[PDB]
Design a protein around this ligand. Sequence first.
Ligand code: HXG
Ligand code: HXG
Ligand code: D10
Ligand code: D10
Ligand code: CU
Ligand code: CU
Ligand code: CU
Lengths: 388, 388, 388, 97
Amino acid sequence: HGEKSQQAFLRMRTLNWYDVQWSKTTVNVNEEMVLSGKVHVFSAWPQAVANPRVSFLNAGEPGPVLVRTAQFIGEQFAPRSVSLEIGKDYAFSINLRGRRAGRWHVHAQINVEGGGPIIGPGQWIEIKGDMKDFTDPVTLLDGSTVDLEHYGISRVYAWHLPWMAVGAAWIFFWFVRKGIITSYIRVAEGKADDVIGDDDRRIGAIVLALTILATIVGYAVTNSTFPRTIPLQAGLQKPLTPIETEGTVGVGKENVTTELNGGVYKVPGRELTINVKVKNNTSQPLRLGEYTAAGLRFLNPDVFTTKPDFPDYLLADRGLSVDATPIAPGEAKEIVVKIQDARWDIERLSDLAYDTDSQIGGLLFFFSPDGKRYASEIGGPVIPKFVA
Amino acid sequence: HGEKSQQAFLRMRTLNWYDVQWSKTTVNVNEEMVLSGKVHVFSAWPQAVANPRVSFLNAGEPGPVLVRTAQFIGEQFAPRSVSLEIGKDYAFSINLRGRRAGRWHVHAQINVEGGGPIIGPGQWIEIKGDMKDFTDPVTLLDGSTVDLEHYGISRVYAWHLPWMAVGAAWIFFWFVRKGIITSYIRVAEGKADDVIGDDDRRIGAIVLALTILATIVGYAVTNSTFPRTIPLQAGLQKPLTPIETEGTVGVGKENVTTELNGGVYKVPGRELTINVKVKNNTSQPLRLGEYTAAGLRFLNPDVFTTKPDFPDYLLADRGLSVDATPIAPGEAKEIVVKIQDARWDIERLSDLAYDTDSQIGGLLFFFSPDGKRYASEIGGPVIPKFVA
Amino acid sequence: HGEKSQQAFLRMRTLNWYDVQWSKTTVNVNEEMVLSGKVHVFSAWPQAVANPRVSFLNAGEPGPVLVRTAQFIGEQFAPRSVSLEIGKDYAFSINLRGRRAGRWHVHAQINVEGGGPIIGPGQWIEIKGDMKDFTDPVTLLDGSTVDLEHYGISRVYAWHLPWMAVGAAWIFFWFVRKGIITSYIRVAEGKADDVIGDDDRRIGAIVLALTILATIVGYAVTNSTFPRTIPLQAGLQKPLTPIETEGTVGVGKENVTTELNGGVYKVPGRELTINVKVKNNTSQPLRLGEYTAAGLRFLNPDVFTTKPDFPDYLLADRGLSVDATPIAPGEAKEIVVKIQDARWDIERLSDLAYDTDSQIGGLLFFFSPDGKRYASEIGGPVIPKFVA
Amino acid sequence: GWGLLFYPNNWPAIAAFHQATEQHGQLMTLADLIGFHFVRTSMPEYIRMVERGTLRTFGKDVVPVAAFFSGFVSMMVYFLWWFMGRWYSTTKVIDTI
Ligand SMILES: CCCCCC(=O)OC[C@H](COP(=O)(O)OCC[N+](C)(C)C)OC(=O)CCCCC
Ligand SMILES: CCCCCC(=O)OC[C@H](COP(=O)(O)OCC[N+](C)(C)C)OC(=O)CCCCC
Ligand SMILES: CCCCCCCCCC
Ligand SMILES: CCCCCCCCCC
Ligand SMILES: [Cu+2]
Ligand SMILES: [Cu+2]
Ligand SMILES: [Cu+2]
C-alpha cells in the first residue's frame, strides 16, 4: 500500500506485473481466495537493487487479515526463497484464506534480498464474518489435525508464566527478607556479610537444585510428548521454470521487439510522449493495446474496446496515440506513443525527475486481429519537460 | 574417511561421483597408481554451499601416504584451483605414488571455496615397501634432477639452526654476565645504569654489525646459487571442458529426463520408496539399473547381473523395484523405485531427518538392451516415515 | 602512459585491443578528434582482476588536455559505468576536443571496478592554439547555452570567499578584543568569566542570527534562480551489444580456433617460440598475419606487405615464423610461431618471469587471399628459457 | 628494521624452493611442487592467500613494498604491545575478585 513512495524508475525497471487476478473480491471467514498473476523480470536490472537471484513471493496485506495457505511461483510450491532470472517471466498464485472482517487492500509482492520490497497491483478485499470463527486447520505427519490459530499457545503459556512467577517470587523473597535501604546501609557499614550469609546460601542452593530438576523434568516430559521432531526447514529452492507462451517476451519464434528512441514527460503533469521503434517480426497485423509500467495498465482506447476488471487506481483506459495502423507483418517502423492519464501522476510516476536515473521501463502489449497478445519489453532514458 | 558425519542432503546434492576407478589396489613404494572418475555437479546447488566457481581437486588420504605426481580435471592439468559449472559433468584423474607402507583408505575429494570438502568414493590401498626407499624425483628447468623427499632440507637446517644457536648464546651471555635477581635488584635500587652500560653497548653493536654482515653475506651467497628464481605460481585456472558423452545428463540429442514426485524414507530404517516420472526420450528400451546418491552405487539386481568392482562399503547390489519393464522409447511414465539397503543407514544417509532440508539428490542410470548407459539427475523433497 | 609497469600476464589476458584508430594526430584548440577501436575481453579472465561486470570507458591522457565531449561503447552512449561480458568483443569511440597546446600521449583506457586501469594503445597528439580560446559549449534543457570552461565559477567564488572572509573577521575580532596570552592568564587565574561574558554573548548571538538569515536568504535566492534542478544521474547502464562481424572470435559460422601447446620466452631476451594448434574451420586459405598481445601489433612480414598506420612504440613489423603455407580450409594442424621484436622487451612483456602466472594471451589474426580477416583468441602457459 | 630484515634473513632458506620446474607444459616452483606432491587433506590451493597478481603492482618491487609496509605497521604494534607488556607486568593486588 506504500508503493507510491518508492522511486519511480526502480518500480518500473525491476518487475513488470501483468495478468494479475483476484479470484474473489468479497470473501468470508474460512473461505479461500486465490491471487494469481505473471511477473516479468526487467532485462536492465538496476544496479541499486541487488540481483533477484534470492527473492521471496509474498502477499502484500496489512497484517494477517488473510492467512496464506499455499503459494506457487515458477510451477513450484514456494514457502521459502526462490531465484528469479533476469529477463524471464514467471507465473505465481497465492491461496489466501479470510481471517479478519473488514475491507483490506491486498497486493502481490516480491522481495529481493539486497533490494527490498517490490509491490505489485493491489485490490480491495471485503471480508465478512467473525475472527473467533477462524480455523486453519493443518494435518501432521502422524495424521492428527491441529488448528494453527490456537495450537501450542496453551503449552507456551504453561511453560512461560510459571517461570516468570517464580522469578518474581524470588525477587520479592529477597526484597522482603533484606530491605533495599537496610541492606545497602549494612553493606556500606563494612558488614556486607550479615546481609547475605548461610542460611541464605542454603535457600539459594535449594532454589537452584529445584530449578535444575524442573528443567530436566520439563525437558524429559516434553520429549515423551513430541518424540519425533525435525529442525526448521530452510534454504533457497531449486531454480524456477519460466513461462514459455506465447510470448512472454523473449520466447517463441514469433515476438515483437521494441526499442525506445527518446521520451518527454511533463513535470509537473501526466504526459509521456515516447518514440518507440517497433519491429513486428510476427505474422498477424499487430496494434499496441496496453502499457503496464509499475502495474498501471495504460490501455489503448481503440484496441481495448471493453474496459477490463482491474483495480481502478491502476486501470487507465487512456493510453492514447499508437498510430491507428496495424504495423505487422515484417515491418520495422517508429511509432509515437503518448501515455497520458491522471494515474501517472497519482502513482507518483511523474516523480521520475526526482530520481537519480531518468529512465522508464515496462511492457508493451500488441494484439492481433484476433485475441492473440504479444508482449515486448520497453525501457530507456527519457527527458523531462519542465513546464510552468 | 569422515564423510559419514557430513550432512546427508549436502552430500547427495552437491557432487555425484560415478565411474570412479582405482588402477591398483596393492601398490609398492615408488610405484604409480591412478585414481580416476567422473563427477556431476548437481543442478540444484544448495544455498548453504557456495558456488563451485572456485574449487580444488584433491586426493582424500590420511596424510601423504601417497604422493600426488599429477592430477587432471576437465581435460586440464590442475595443480591449482579450478572452476566447476553447475549442472556439468567433469572427468578427473589423479596419478598417485606409493610412499608409506600400510593399508590406507584413499578417497576422491573436491573442495569448494565457500563450502568445504566434498568426499567421494574411497578404496583401501595396500602399500608394500619401506619409507626410506622413496624418491620422487623431479627435474628442474636447467635439466638437473632433484629428489623432493630430501631436497632443500639440508640448506634450511644449515641456515636455521645456527641462528637459533646464536640467539641462545646471546641470551646465555647476557644471563651469565648479569644475573636475573642481581640485575633486578640493581635496577630497583635506582642504579639501573651499572646493570647495562658501555662496554655492554659496544658488545651489542659488535653483535649487530656481525649479524647484518652475515645476513648480507648470506643473501648474496644464496643469490650466487639459484641465480634465476621465480615467484610462487598461483591463481584460478582457465574454465574446464565438461564431458559430452553420451550422456552425461544434459548433453546429446538422446537423454532420459527424470522428475521426483514424492518419496518416503523409514526413520529409523533403510528404505526410500521414491516415485520417479521417467521420460524416455531416447531410442532403445531403457531400464533403470543404478542410483549413485553420495557415491553409494545402489545397483538394480536384474540389470546389474554381475556385481561390479567397487568398494564394498558403497556397492549395494539391492537397489530394488524399477518396473521389470523396459520403458523407452518415447514414453513418459511414472515408476516406483524402492531403494533399500543397510548401506543407506550405515553411510548415515538415513539421517536426512536431522537435516534442515529433507531433499534427496543423485544420478539415475538407465541401460539399453546393449551396454549403452544413459544418465539422469534426480532430486527433490522427500517425506520421512517415522517408524516406532 | 604507465602501462609498462603493469604486470605482463594481466595486461595480455584481460583486454585485447585491436582496430584502434585516432582520427587526427595534429589538432587545434576547439577542434574535434575521434579515438575509436575494438576491444576483446579475454575468456580466461584472471582471478586477480575482478569481473568486468562493472567497468568504465576512459581516455588515458595527462589530465584534461583533451575534453571528452562524448564516448560510446557497445553501441551505447556511455558516460557512466558499463558491463563487459567475458569473451565478447566491443566497439568503442571517444569524441575528444583540443584544450591544451602541446604534445600529449593519449591512450584508450578501460577501468574495471575491482581490477583497476587497463591501458590500451596510445598515440602522440599535437595540439596547437591557446588555452584561453577554449570553449566547450553545452546547451541546457531550457535551450540556453553555457560554456563549461567558465560557467558557475563566479557564483562559487561569490558564495565561498565572502564566508571565508567572515570567518577570518570573526577570528580576528575575538583575537583583538581578547588577547591569547591575556585571556589564557585570565582563565588560569580562576576568573575565566570576565574573558567571555555578555555583552560578548550578545555579539555572538547577533552574528548567529545574521548568519542564519544569510543562509536562508542565500538558499531562497539561489532557489529563485535555477528553480528546476535534478539530482546527480548515476548507475550502471543497460547491457551492451557486442560485435558480430565477422568474426570477432566466437561469432559467425566461419571462425579460426587456436590452442597453445607450450611456449618458450628467452629471459633476458625478446623471443617467444609458441606452438599453436590452428583449426581452420573457415572456407578461404588462411595465413597468420598479426598477434596483438597488450596492443603490441606483431605483424607477420609476409602477409602485412605494407606497414600500417599505428603508434611505432607498439607496431612491430617482425612477428616472424607462421609456416609460409596457407592452412585453410578444413585442416587442423600445429604451426610454430616465433614472436621476436625489441618491443616485446621494451614494453616489459619479457618480465613475464617476474609474474606469479607465466601465461600469455592475446589475439591471433588470420587473413584470406583477399582482405578478409579472422580473429582467434590464443592463451595459455609458457615456459621461460633462462639464458646467459 | 624488524620488517625490512625479515625477507633477507629468510631468503637463504626458501630460495632453493623457488627454482622453476616444468610440469605438464606449465611453470611451477619447487615449493608449489612440494605442496602439490605431499597431499594435505584440508588445504586446497584457493585458500593460500598469496600474491596472485594485481593491476597496480609495478614490477620488481613487490618484496621491497611489502617489507617496508610491515616495517612501520610494526611500530604501531610495537608501541601497543610494549605497553601491553608493561600492563602484564603489573604488581597490583585487588581486594576482592
Ligand atoms: C636487508 C639487507 C640484506 C638484503 C639486501 C638485498 O640485496 O636485498 C634487497 C632486495 C630488494 O628487492 P629487489 O631486488 O627489488 O627484488 C628481489 C626479490 N626477491 C628477493 C624475491 C628475488 O631483496 C629483497 O626483496 C629483500 C627485502 C628488502 C630489504 C631491503
Ligand atoms: C611515549 C608515549 C608514552 C605513553 C604512556 C604514558 O605516558 O602513560 C599514559 C598511560 C597511563 O600510564 P601511567 O599509569 O602513567 O604509567 C606510566 C608508565 N608507562 C609509561 C609504562 C605507561 O599509559 C598507558 O596505559 C599506555 C598508553 C599508550 C598505549 C595505548
Ligand atoms: C631508492 C631507489 C629506488 C629503486 C627503485 C624502486 C624500488 C622500490 C623501493 C620502494
Ligand atoms: C592484557 C592487559 C590488560 C591490562 C593489564 C592490567 C593493567 C593494570 C593497570 C595499572
Ligand atoms: Cu495498498
Ligand atoms: Cu575413508
Ligand atoms: Cu603513454
